[PDB]
Every structure is written in C-alpha cells, then in structure tokens.
Amino acid sequence: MIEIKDKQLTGLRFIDLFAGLGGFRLALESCGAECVYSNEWDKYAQEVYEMNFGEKPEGDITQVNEKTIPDHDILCAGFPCQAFSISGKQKGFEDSRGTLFFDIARIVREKKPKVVFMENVKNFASHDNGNTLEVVKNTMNELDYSFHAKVLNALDYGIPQKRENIYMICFRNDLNIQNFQFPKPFELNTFVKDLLLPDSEVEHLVIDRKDLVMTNQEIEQTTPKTVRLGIVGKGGQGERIYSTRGIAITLSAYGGGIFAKTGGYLVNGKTRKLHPRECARVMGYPDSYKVHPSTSQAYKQFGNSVVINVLQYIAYNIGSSLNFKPY
DNA sequence: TGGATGCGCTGAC
DNA sequence: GTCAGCGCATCC
Ligand SMILES: Nc1ncnc2c1ncn2[C@@H]1O[C@H](CSCC[C@H](N)C(=O)O)[C@@H](O)[C@H]1O
Structure with missing residues (x-):
C-alpha cells in the first residue's frame, strides 16, 4: 500500500462487510476514515482479522438485523464471487453464495450511508448477459443512489498482478456527487x-x-x-x-x-x-500485516482479498468528491 | 469453516 | 487456436 498525506476521509465512519483480511479497512483507514463495524463469518478470517485489528468480526450477515448495525457514512463490501467468477460454475444469484448482495441492499435500505463501495470479480460485469450488473445498478438506483462501475486491472496502479475486478461506487442522490472518477492508470x-x-x-x-x-x-x-x-x-x-x-x-x-x-x-x-x-x-499488503498462522488459510484469504493500492486510490477519489462542496 | 492437488470448462481474445 | 481464472469436486 501507499502513503496518503491528505486524509480525504477524516471524520467519516465505515463498516467492513465480508471483511476477510480487512483490505477495505486498511485502504479506508489510510485515508483517515474510522471503522465502526466489521462482519466476517469465517473462523480463520476472523482470527487473522483480530490479529491485525483487535476485534472479532460479527458472523453470518444473513442473520444480522440491519437495524443493529451502527450508523456509518461508507459501506464497504467485497462480497462473495465464486458464483460469478469466470473460474467457477457461474450459477450467480441461483447460488447460495451468490445472493449476498441483497443483504447489502437490505443494510443500505435501512442504514442509508453516503457511499456504498463494493468489489467483485471481472466476470461480474458480464455475467448472465450483463443482467447481474444491471440488477445491482437498478437496486442501487431505486435505493436512491448513483451507480459508478468499472473494471480496473491492478497492473495499472503500481501492483504487479493482472488482477481485474469490478469496482462499484454508489453515492446517495441527495449528495449530488457529480465529480466522482475512477483513478487513472499510470x-x-x-x-x-x-x-x-x-x-x-x-x-x-x-x-x-x-x-x-x-x-x-x-x-x-x-x-x-x-x-x-x-x-x-x-x-x-x-x-x-x-x-x-x-x-x-x-x-x-x-x-x-x-x-x-x-x-x-x-x-x-x-x-x-x-x-x-x-x-x-x-x-x-504492508509487511506489518500479520498473516494467518496456517499457510493454507493465508493463501485462501489473500486469494479472496483486494488490492490495497487500488482501493486507496478509489477511496481517495470518493473523499475528494464528498469534500467538494463549493458555495 | 482442514490440507492438498488434479482438473475442466468458460470467457475473451 | 491461445490462455488465464477471489473455482470445483474428491481424496485423505
Ligand atoms: N454470510 C456471510 N456472512 C459473513 N461473511 C460472509 C458470508 N459469506 C461469505 N462471507 C465472507 O465474505 C468474504 C468474501 S471475500 C472478501 C475479502 C475482503 N475484501 C478482504 O479484503 O480480504 C469471505 O471472507 C467470506 O468468508
């Protein structure tokens, strides 16, 4: 990850859903944001998470009452991808692991944060003739949010990995955010x-x-x-x-x-x-991040994770847009 | 929600 | 035809 001198997200609160290693937490915290809730049901993911952040994430999001979730400005969620990945069976919403997005919608509908920042695999943008993305777009739209989606390759942001993922940034409409932009490649x-x-x-x-x-x-x-x-x-x-x-x-x-x-x-x-x-x-990930004692679990967690640098550039741009409030 | 590896098929050229 | 994929089902 890189250093962020202008903490664009200072004073903002976010939640870390489908937390995993806490990739979104590292990225948003480096921009000055405060995490107020994390959810991750995997035993080993919870351990490495606590190992690095000192708190045990709450389990199964499908069983959590969204009203119990703390108020926050930004909802982060890199939800399950096995059901949409080009490497899997692509059952999508028909998969028991492919409907977690509707849990996100449930939480948003109730908590209505300023921003919803999600991530998933590249094939998510093409899955089911684009219907899957369309569904997320319309759901966010009817939830009264704007929808900004784009597939970014990590190799364009200083990281030597051809990882391509779809990043979806959603701003609540009443915020009239008209200047959000995905980071430019370098x-x-x-x-x-x-x-x-x-x-x-x-x-x-x-x-x-x-x-x-x-x-x-x-x-x-x-x-x-x-x-x-x-x-x-x-x-x-x-x-x-x-x-x-x-x-x-x-x-x-x-x-x-x-x-x-x-x-x-x-x-x-x-x-x-x-x-x-x-x-x-x-x-x-920084060398200061403690990996799980099980190499097998660590490989699984990093392979499920996000590229910190990419999320940092995006998080920084989200904050830049939220902070632009001229008279 | 163990650890390990051989695998097959889709998507985007 | 080329080749890469937050995967899969099975084995212990
Ligand atoms: N029902 C559920 N409740 C809570 N967490 C869940 C869940 N279904 C899947 N998850 C968790 O969702 C995560 C998706 S992968 C996301 C990893 C994360 N961005 C990090 O940086 O590493 C997995 O860790 C998985 O265990």
Missing part, C-alpha cells in the same frame, strides 16, 4: 521479482517436477504483463509457471494445482509457488 514500475523474499526463506516452496515443460524463454526485460515460461502436468490452473520479470497472475481462494492459489514462478533457476508474505505483497 506506468507500472514494480514487478514480481521486486516483491520476492530471499531464497533462504522459500526453499521449502521449491518444486522439482520431472514433467516440467519450459515452453518459452526467460525474459531479461521487465514487462507489465504475465509471461508464461512453462507448465507441469496438463498446464491447468496451478500448473503454469511465469516469469518474475513480468507480473503475477490473479491470486485465488480455492485454487488447485501444484502451484495452487499463486501460480508457479521461475526464481534463480528453480520453479516454486509464492510464499504467503509474497502473496501479501502482490495484494498490496
């Missing part, structure tokens, strides 16, 4: 090899598979794209090896393959997946 100057830990700390991640098939030549020049160098097995998910001179592939929560949830990388002649701390860095 040149990437950080690559995977810049975030890697020393070899001595990741030796245990070195995999020597005799079915490795290097398909491409290593590149000596850094590039803002993923560069596949080879595969193992059939080259499916978690079976692809990339260059550390390029950018990382999207970190995943339930990913499979020998290089599960991170992808494989060529590092000083050996192939290995990423270390939880490297996943943290690829997601824009």
Whole structure:
C-alpha cells in the first residue's frame, strides 16, 4: 500500500462487510476514515482479522438485523464471487453464495450511508448477459443512489498482478456527487521479482517436477504483463509457471494445482509457488500485516482479498468528491 | 469453516 | 487456436 498525506476521509465512519483480511479497512483507514463495524463469518478470517485489528468480526450477515448495525457514512463490501467468477460454475444469484448482495441492499435500505463501495470479480460485469450488473445498478438506483462501475486491472496502479475486478461506487442522490472518477492508470514500475523474499526463506516452496515443460524463454526485460515460461502436468490452473520479470497472475481462494492459489514462478533457476508474505505483497499488503498462522488459510484469504493500492486510490477519489462542496 | 492437488470448462481474445 | 481464472469436486 501507499502513503496518503491528505486524509480525504477524516471524520467519516465505515463498516467492513465480508471483511476477510480487512483490505477495505486498511485502504479506508489510510485515508483517515474510522471503522465502526466489521462482519466476517469465517473462523480463520476472523482470527487473522483480530490479529491485525483487535476485534472479532460479527458472523453470518444473513442473520444480522440491519437495524443493529451502527450508523456509518461508507459501506464497504467485497462480497462473495465464486458464483460469478469466470473460474467457477457461474450459477450467480441461483447460488447460495451468490445472493449476498441483497443483504447489502437490505443494510443500505435501512442504514442509508453516503457511499456504498463494493468489489467483485471481472466476470461480474458480464455475467448472465450483463443482467447481474444491471440488477445491482437498478437496486442501487431505486435505493436512491448513483451507480459508478468499472473494471480496473491492478497492473495499472503500481501492483504487479493482472488482477481485474469490478469496482462499484454508489453515492446517495441527495449528495449530488457529480465529480466522482475512477483513478487513472499510470506506468507500472514494480514487478514480481521486486516483491520476492530471499531464497533462504522459500526453499521449502521449491518444486522439482520431472514433467516440467519450459515452453518459452526467460525474459531479461521487465514487462507489465504475465509471461508464461512453462507448465507441469496438463498446464491447468496451478500448473503454469511465469516469469518474475513480468507480473503475477490473479491470486485465488480455492485454487488447485501444484502451484495452487499463486501460480508457479521461475526464481534463480528453480520453479516454486509464492510464499504467503509474497502473496501479501502482490495484494498490496504492508509487511506489518500479520498473516494467518496456517499457510493454507493465508493463501485462501489473500486469494479472496483486494488490492490495497487500488482501493486507496478509489477511496481517495470518493473523499475528494464528498469534500467538494463549493458555495 | 482442514490440507492438498488434479482438473475442466468458460470467457475473451 | 491461445490462455488465464477471489473455482470445483474428491481424496485423505
Ligand atoms: N454470510 C456471510 N456472512 C459473513 N461473511 C460472509 C458470508 N459469506 C461469505 N462471507 C465472507 O465474505 C468474504 C468474501 S471475500 C472478501 C475479502 C475482503 N475484501 C478482504 O479484503 O480480504 C469471505 O471472507 C467470506 O468468508
């Protein structure tokens, strides 16, 4: 994450729904905002959350009475994506994990915050011929909010990862916010090899598979794209090896393959997946963030998370728009 | 809501 | 045809 000198969100209160690692909390707090409520039902996510913020998030949002939720100015929610991701079965709203948005609508309808800041996977924008996004748009609209949605790639915001996600910013209508803008892309100057830990700390991640098939030549020049160098097995998910001179592939929560949830990388002649701390860095998390003691749970959490830097630039722009109140 | 890995199919070229 | 995906079902 980056440093924010102008705390655009000072004095504002927000809630952290589907909290996970608290990515939205880090981003909004760096802008001066105050978290007044968090909700996360996963046991291990709750532990790492408390480990970093000192509070245990409330469980199952579907069982929480929205009237009990504290007053807040900004509602943050990176809701479940398994049902909309290009990597899943795309059952969408028909999935028991695909209807969490209506819980968000329920909370908004009752708490009516100034802003609703949501995030989901790229395919969310195309799912069901665009009907899924349309439904969220109309729901927000009839809830009396404006709807700003756009898919941003983390590689355009200083993070070496081709992670694309849809960001949806909603302003209450009575606020007449007419100058909100998604952050503009800038040149990437950080690559995977810049975030890697020393070899001595990741030796245990070195995999020597005799079915490795290097398909491409290593590149000596850094590039803002993923560069596949080879595969193992059939080259499916978690079976692809990339260059550390390029950018990382999207970190995943339930990913499979020998290089599960991170992808494989060529590092000083050996192939290995990423270390939880490297996943943290690829997601824009500061080294001060405490990862979960279970590497398995940490991989799942970072793969489910958000890119801090991207949320910071957005949060900053949300605050800039809310603070523009000329006579 | 364990940890691990082989997998298959969709989306966007 | 190329290839990447906050995934999936199964195994222990
Ligand atoms: N019914 C429910 N109640 C509360 N939390 C839920 C939930 N269904 C899913 N979740 C939580 O929703 C999260 C979605 S992924 C969001 C991660 C978050 N942005 C962070 O930065 O890491 C998961 O952690 C999941 O456990």
